[PDB]
Write a protein that binds this DNA or RNA. Structure first.
Ligand SMILES: *C(=O)CSCCNC(=O)CCNC(=O)[C@H](O)C(C)(C)COP(=O)(O)OP(=O)(O)OC[C@H]1O[C@@H](n2cnc3c(N)ncnc32)[C@H](O)[C@@H]1OP(=O)(O)O
Lengths: 106, 9, 96, 46, 274, 113, 93, 80, 270, 87, 94, 106, 92
DNA sequence: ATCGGATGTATATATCTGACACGTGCCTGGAGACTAGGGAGTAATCCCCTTGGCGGTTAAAACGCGGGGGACAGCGCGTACGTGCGTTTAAGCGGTGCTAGAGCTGTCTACGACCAATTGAGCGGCCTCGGCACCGGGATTCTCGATGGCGGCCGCGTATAGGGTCCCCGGAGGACAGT
DNA sequence: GACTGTCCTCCGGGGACCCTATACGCGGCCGCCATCGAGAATCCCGGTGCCGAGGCCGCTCAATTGGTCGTAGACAGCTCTAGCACCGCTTAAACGCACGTACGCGCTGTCCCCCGCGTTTTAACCGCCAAGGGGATTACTCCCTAGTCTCCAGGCACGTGTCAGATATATACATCCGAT
């Protein structure tokens, strides 16, 4: 009987097996449930998809076909929820959002 | 659809 | 002759540097400062280039955030010139 | 007939009375007009 | 949604008259009470009582309007002297005991209207406004109605008062009971919950002197001006009645002169400028 | 007894009074303009009759004397209607002002007690 | 020596969301670091949840509760939807 | 090494301020900024060196800096 | 049981806390100007013989060749507004007379006749609304329903909201009929604005030009398919059905509220 | 038509004197009138976040009662460790 | 009549000298249950949990007022204003 | 052979055995060194001694013989290093340090 | 039965101030403090062991964690106390 | 700067309670002692990459000289915030009674740990080319100060106007001369 | 000498062009709007040119399967704490209102200091060459710690007594504020 990847059984792209192994070797609990790695991989894949979608939109908005860290910074800092999630994170080569205070303008 | 922002500004 | 009014060049620089994303500090002086500071903990320490680059990135990001807070404080006092007491206030509010 | 002439004299006197009353009412109307104007000035301007 | 499409046949009977549209938008703040007249309306029992016991063979006619004036005066007097008549309806005052209050009663601002009718110099006629129905001018004064029929009407109205246990003849909306501030039944409504009782003022004289008296003076000034304008309109009315009388008398005089063929002395048949 | 409540209630009751007074006074003005116009309309005809009598006496009848008299009667009657309307309007306005004045007087008397 | 990463899966997701878009190496490193960060956060929170209730097994329930704790609003809602859907589909076959 | 903090010059500081959105700068700002930077660097380098010594290595790796920033609540992406 | 308002005998829809004596009457008489109730035909006749009111007891702030609008304070006209609320409970199961009529403003639309102004509908309004509702209760007489009158009432409510420089929404527990009517009004106004504007427009500009709340706009956009996500962004979507509905709207030529005939200034409450 | 009296707000119970007392303990000498409303809003936001996390812990434990330890854990998750109730 | 500020200073000393809670317990408890309704119905509460919530809330508010006072002093004023609170929370990262 | 507590072998008051057990049952690592619980217990005892000493001094300074949370708050907030260590900690019934800004004084 | 550091805190108090008592709430605060410091140190030691791919928590990891968490003189004196204690224990 | 009046706050004392301090019996968590495997220490190795030098190019830092404009002090008005007092509200306390549900215990199954045998996905190394960076020329509409101009208040008389001002106008009476 | 009529000189009063009002003709200036030219805003089109990203290809080793075994945990039943809820009395505290001042705020004037720009000077940057420390690797081998099984006394629950401090009361001292 040929083997089917647990990712394919769950219809996921992220490696369920690698996640399960990292959980076992991460000293988190004595035992690991069967569905927990599947759930975690699904959540990670979803968040990756959200960020990649926003970064792709930003890259198109800058007439670029290759995503660079600047696009990641713009995508994250322009999303309220993602910005709140990553409020204590610094992105290398990310830059800053263009923002000029009104009172300084003539 | 799976993603957010069904309707925003 | 031609001269721009004070503050126009400032706004132009603000737009320029908010548009770009390169490090604004000179590499070598920063590295010399880093090694100078590190001498006071252990003698003859070696540094990977990436470690110095990460330090420079973190330092510049921290200073940029501090300057934004300082600008907000200066504006709160109905001024446009940031002063040392603004920095002290910002760091105090943060908890430093 | 003296009856119709008596009615004629009665109507003549009554019409003279109504003519006098008409003139008096016209005069009173003009007086009230001026009094209203002066009172308006007093109450609202002054 | 349930149907509402049924038409009433007596609409033309109950809805008559004509309302005139004004060029400028209507300006109005008077209440419903101002434009309705007597607050009491006779029912079938009241009209049968009046027709069969009061107006069946009387040489002096008591009108339905005068009947409602009497019943309204009895109501008001009873609520004034006996606010708690519903506590003991059988102890209701007699007609003679209530009569002095009826004499001193001021129903529908009658005293104010009479004072105004005196001030306009229009007390020859009566004081009539747009808020008053035309039919109620003819009614006799209240005091006359009291002297002629007060006991006769009051006995019947007292009987009906007792029948309704000292309450109102007209069926009333259900009211909040102080015992419980929340009433389960829907019936209880329009209660106190939309009034907000204020703080009392033990020591406020200043406001009364400063602004109340000044505004009273301004109202007096406006009343004087309106009285002058009303008198001007009264004299203009007298003038137009003079013009009508003069025209009729002039045409009669001219016809009589032409019948008798009398010449000259035509000055009174024509107008003279002055 | 609340003086401030009395003042507030009096001002509220008189808040719409000047607007209604302006409305009534200008309706009386419009009716008086209609009265003046109808006065011209029938004064011209009465001038015709009077001048006819001045020149030829009262015994001869004007060829349209009955029609002129009926027209004068009509114009005078609608003048009477206009004046009735003006008088009623003025009576209503005076009623409102005197009612407010008397209510204020009653409240002032109660506060004076 | 083999040093594992998440790069290929990020690339697959990028191809599924923007088939005509590429990514620089530095951005791929940033994404890999972000994934490791979120993984560590969620696993730590799940460990604390298991410890508080004196359990010795990390099940799907703990992961779901940790996600609800860490993700704000609609992010949490959609992440829970995705997790439940994926677990159901895996349980099916 | 001594007084290399003067390497952080006036134009570099004002460049950082411009990126931060500052329009007008007092002359006294620069020394304060240098002091703040020195404090920050000392705090980070101390932990970095502590990680390096615990691993018994004589070379500071980037991961040591990353772990120090993580310990100070300043997580950094883009270095592993 | 059944009520005779003016010439129309109506069949009530729900309970209304009238005096039980009227629940004991076969016929209920309602004055067409004062809204007074009667169980006695004689009292109705006497009242009509003495009732001189031939228009809503308030100032006329609007008038066209068809209808006029009157602004009435519940505190000033307490009995009349109580009569209105009592009559209104008969046609909404959900009306609340648990509170008196004082803090409510009543804007009543009437049609003029030789007998006077005939009320066809109205909408109430809290003097001080915390939720920002520009309409509290809106009742249109069933003998005048399905005639477009409710549309005109909503038009006037938003005209007031524009005159107040505010956005407004009806009390959110809308009835099925009220919900459908507001769906129709919102759809018609949004389509008319979109077609006549002919340009890309911001949501806040729509809300400023129509006094409609942005939430209403968004919910209508979800009910419709006006907004589409196409090429990484949401954009105006000019499909066939939209223009077809706009053409049916242009062909119906419905009555509209003329703002220039509104001589009215917002009341000031202390 | 008011449907439910569930809209009652207890945030008002945070009276002006209480807010003044808090400011006095904080060293405030003069207070603008709008401070009280701003404070009520800030407190509402803070309590909503903390309570949300506490209820999440309670539901995870499949208990109907919110314990003190749940509150402590929520504060821990917000970086506001509290001493004097356990753990 | 004491001049404005003397009583304020006396209150400052009095309340910095004590440690008791300054909010009445019952209104706070009702507010807590009201906010709790919005996540799950018929939730029950231990008293100690409510007391811990009140402790944390009062400490947070005191710290916020200290920061606000510093901001007000910075603007050369002595009356705190909502803008000062907004600035404090903004700088804090909230 | 009678048993001697590991605390007595290390001359400590804190329970070495309890600390070792908590380490084993705390899911920190696969294995626990022998001296680690001793070291940790010693450090905890030292910190406890420092705080108790400062609190006792404060209690004497307030003419009290029983330490209350107020004394703990004063002791912690008056020590620069302890204050830095507990900068994110709130002490119930602890109060605040008396501190009046100069500009507010007359 | 619920365990706590109460008796050990009491012994330390009697060592430092024999004539001073403590309220129960203060004892609870101290117990929470002890548990907090324990968790912080243990977590830091676990992270150190993981970063160096070791599966054993030795005293060296504890010492490094203490140096990371405790500021200055506190760290120096804590390290001194731990070293002395370990030394005395290893000779017994 | 000096002094008295009035309020708060610290101080001395006495009483009364409950929470802190201490005692006991118990058991279960820690101390002994033993084994076996493998994590970790150690040695020895390779070569990467870190450090450290030279020397040319030139961007950028440093320096200096205006001067405009923003920080700063003063000052004058008024609102609004603090203070005090009397009225009103409900928080607080205590007391009673109920039952949801937290907590515990005893079942026994299902699931996850574990190991061995299997193999393909994913990693490291290896190309290959076009997306993106650079190096030019080019290039409309957007800001900003500048002054020219249609037309309004005011200088500043002028054409007309209520009216000070007195030499002449009107008819009627007295003296020289005539009918 | 008396009476009728015509010339000339004197009281009473119309008047005529007037003393400096009065109001606008007819502009100065001035005032803000009406264009209106100069710099400028980086941006843009197009080669072109490389090197990083993406595709291929072995080759493991980590992921899969298929068993087996043991216990964590799911579940049912049961106890009883404590959370909730209502009643009723006390009074501390909140609330409302009236009053006055001192603080915020706007505005005006001063000046010194930071921006802009031009010129000079440094030294960062880069490309290149070279050594060798030490990070990374592998291969061995010890001994330390998990796991077991036994043993018993430290620490917990749980009772028990009394004194530190809360509370109350009476009092002297410190602090604020008005008066001089
Ligand atoms: C709480 O939020 C307070 S608001 C609710 C207060 N109560 C309340 O409204 C109940 C009593 N009044 C009404 O419900 C009243 O009818 C109104 C206020 C809804 C006004 O309705 P109208 O009928 O007068 O409104 P129109 O402008 O004429 O439009 C009517 C639309 O409704 C459709 N309709 C009506 N009855 C229908 C049935 N039985 N079946 C189908 N469609 C029905 C009409 O077709 C028309 O639709 P349009 O698309 O043409 O507008």
């Amino acid at each position: 009987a040929k083997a089917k990847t647990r990712s394919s059984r769950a219809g996921l792209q992220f490696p369920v097996g690698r996640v399960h192994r990292l959980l076992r070797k991460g000293n988190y609990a004595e035992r690991v449930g069967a569905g927990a790695p599947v759930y975690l991989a699904a959540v990670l894949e979803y968040l990756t998809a959200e960020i990649l979608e926003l970064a792709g939109n930003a890259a198109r908005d800058n007439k670029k076909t290759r995503i660079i860290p600047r696009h990641l910074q713009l995508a994250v800092r322009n999303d309220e929820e993602l910005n709140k999630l990553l409020g204590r994170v610094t992105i290398a080569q990310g830059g800053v959002l263009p923002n000029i205070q009104s009172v300084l303008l003539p | 659809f799976r993603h957010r922002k069904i309707s925003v500004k | 002759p031609h001269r721009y009014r004070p503050g126009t060049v400032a706004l132009r620089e603000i737009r320029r540097y908010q548009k770009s994303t390169e490090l604004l500090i000179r590499k070598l002086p920063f590295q010399r400062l880093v090694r100078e500071i590190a001498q006071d903990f252990k003698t003859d320490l070696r540094f990977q280039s990436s470690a110095v680059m990460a330090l420079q990135e973190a330092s510049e990001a921290y200073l940029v955030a501090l300057f934004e807070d300082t600008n907000l404080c200066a504006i709160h006092a109905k001024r446009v010139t940031i002063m040392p007491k603004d920095i002290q206030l910002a760091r105090r509010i943060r908890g430093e | 007939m003296t009856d119709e002439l008596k009615s004629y004299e009665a109507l003549k006197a009554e019409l003279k009375k109504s003519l006098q009353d008409r003139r008096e009412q016209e005069d009173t109307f003009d007086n009230l007009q001026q009094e209203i104007y002066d009172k308006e000035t007093e109450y609202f301007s002054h | 949604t349930p149907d509402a499409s049924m038409t009433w046949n007596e609409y033309d009977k109950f809805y008559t008259g004509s309302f005139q549209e004004t060029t400028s938008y209507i300006k109005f703040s008077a209440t419903v009470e101002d434009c309705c007249g007597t607050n009491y309306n006779m029912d079938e029992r009241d009209e049968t009582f009046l027709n069969e016991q009061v107006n069946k063979g009387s040489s002096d006619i008591l009108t339905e309007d005068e009947f409602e004036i009497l019943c309204s005066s009895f109501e008001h007097a009873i609520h004034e002297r006996q606010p708690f008549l519903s506590m003991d309806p059988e102890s209701i005052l007699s007609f003679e005991e209530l009569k002095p209050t009826l004499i001193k009663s001021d129903m529908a601002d009658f005293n104010l209207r009479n004072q105004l009718n005196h001030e306009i110099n229009s007390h020859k006629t009566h004081f009539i406004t747009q808020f008053d129905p035309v039919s109620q001018m003819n009614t006799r004064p209240l005091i006359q109605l009291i002297e002629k029929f007060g006991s006769k009407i009051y006995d019947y109205w007292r009987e009906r008062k007792i029948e309704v246990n000292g309450y109102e003849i007209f069926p009333q909306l259900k009211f909040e009971r102080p015992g419980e501030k929340e009433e389960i039944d829907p019936y209880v409504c329009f209660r106190r919950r939309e009034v907000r009782h204020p703080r009392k003022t033990r020591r406020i004289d200043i406001l009364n002197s400063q602004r109340l008296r000044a505004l009273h003076q301004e109202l007096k000034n406006a009343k004087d001006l309106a009285l002058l304008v009303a008198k001007r309109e009264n004299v203009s009315l007298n003038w137009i009645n003079d013009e009508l009388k003069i025209f009729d008398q002039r045409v009669k005089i001219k016809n009589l002169k032409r019948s008798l063929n009398i010449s000259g002395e035509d000055d009174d048949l024509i107008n003279h400028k002055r | 007894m609340d003086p401030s409540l009395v003042l507030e209630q009096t001002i509220q009751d008189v808040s719409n009074l000047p607007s209604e007074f302006r409305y009534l006074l200008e309706e009386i003005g419009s009716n008086d303009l209609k009265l003046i116009e109808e006065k011209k309309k029938y004064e011209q005809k009465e001038s015709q009759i009077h001048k006819f009598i001045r020149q030829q006496g009262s015994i001869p009848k004007h060829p349209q004397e009955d029609g002129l008299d009926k027209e004068i009667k009509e114009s005078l009657l609608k003048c009477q209607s206009l004046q009735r309307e003006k008088c009623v309007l003025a009576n209503t306005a005076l009623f409102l002002i005197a009612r407010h004045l008397n209510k204020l007087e009653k409240n002032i008397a109660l506060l004076e007690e | 020596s083999r040093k594992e990463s998440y790069a290929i899966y990020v690339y697959k997701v990028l191809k599924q969301v923007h088939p005509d878009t590429g990514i620089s190496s530095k951005a791929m490193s940033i994404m890999n670091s972000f994934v490791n960060d979120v993984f560590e956060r969620i696993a730590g929170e799940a460990s604390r949840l298991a410890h508080y209730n004196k359990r010795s097994t990390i099940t799907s329930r703990e992961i779901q509760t940790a996600v609800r704790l860490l993700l704000p609003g609609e992010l949490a809602k959609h992440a829970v939807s995705e997790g439940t859907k994926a677990v159901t589909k895996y349980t099916s076959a | 090494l001594r007084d290399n903090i003067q390497g952080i010059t006036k134009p570099a500081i004002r460049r950082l301020a411009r990126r931060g959105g500052v329009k007008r700068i007092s002359g006294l700002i620069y020394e304060e900024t240098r002091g703040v930077l020195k404090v920050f660097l000392e705090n980070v380098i101390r932990d970095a060196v502590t990680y390096t010594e615990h691993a018994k290595r004589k070379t500071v790796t980037a991961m040591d800096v990353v772990y120090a920033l993580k310990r100070q609540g300043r997580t950094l992406y883009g270095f592993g | 049981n059944r009520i005779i308002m003016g010439k129309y005998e109506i069949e009530p829809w729900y309970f209304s806390p009238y005096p039980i004596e009227l629940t004991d009457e076969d016929f209920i008489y309602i004055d067409d100007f004062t809204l007074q109730y009667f169980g006695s035909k004689k009292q109705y006749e006497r009242y009509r013989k003495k009732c001189t009111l031939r228009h809503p007891p308030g100032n006329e702030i609007y008038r066209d060749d068809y209808v006029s609008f009157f602004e009435i304070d519940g505190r000033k006209q307490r009995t009349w507004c109580r009569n209105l609320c009592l009559l209104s409970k008969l046609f909404l199961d959900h009306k609340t007379l648990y509170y008196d009529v004082d803090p409510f403003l009543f804007y009543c639309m009437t049609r003029r006749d030789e007998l006077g102004h005939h009320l066809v509908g109205y909408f109430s309004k809290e003097k001080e609304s915390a939720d920002g509702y520009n309409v509290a209760c809106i009742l249109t007489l069933p003998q005048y329903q399905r005639m477009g009158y409710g549309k005109l009432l909503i038009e006037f409510s938003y005209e007031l909201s524009k005159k107040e420089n505010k956005v407004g929404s009806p009390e959110k527990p809308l009835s099925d009929l009220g919900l459908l009517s507001y769906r129709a009004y919102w759809s018609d106004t949004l389509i008319t604005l979109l077609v006549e504007h002919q340009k890309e427009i911001t949501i806040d500009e729509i809300s400023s030009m129509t006094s409609m709340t942005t939430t209403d706009i968004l919910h209508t956009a979800k009910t419709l398919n006006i907004l589409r996500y196409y090429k990484g962004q949401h954009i105006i979507f000019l499909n066939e059905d939209i223009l077809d509905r706009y053409n049916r709207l242009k062909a119906k030529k419905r009555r509209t509220i003329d703002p220039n005939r509104l001589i009215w200034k917002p009341p000031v409450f202390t």
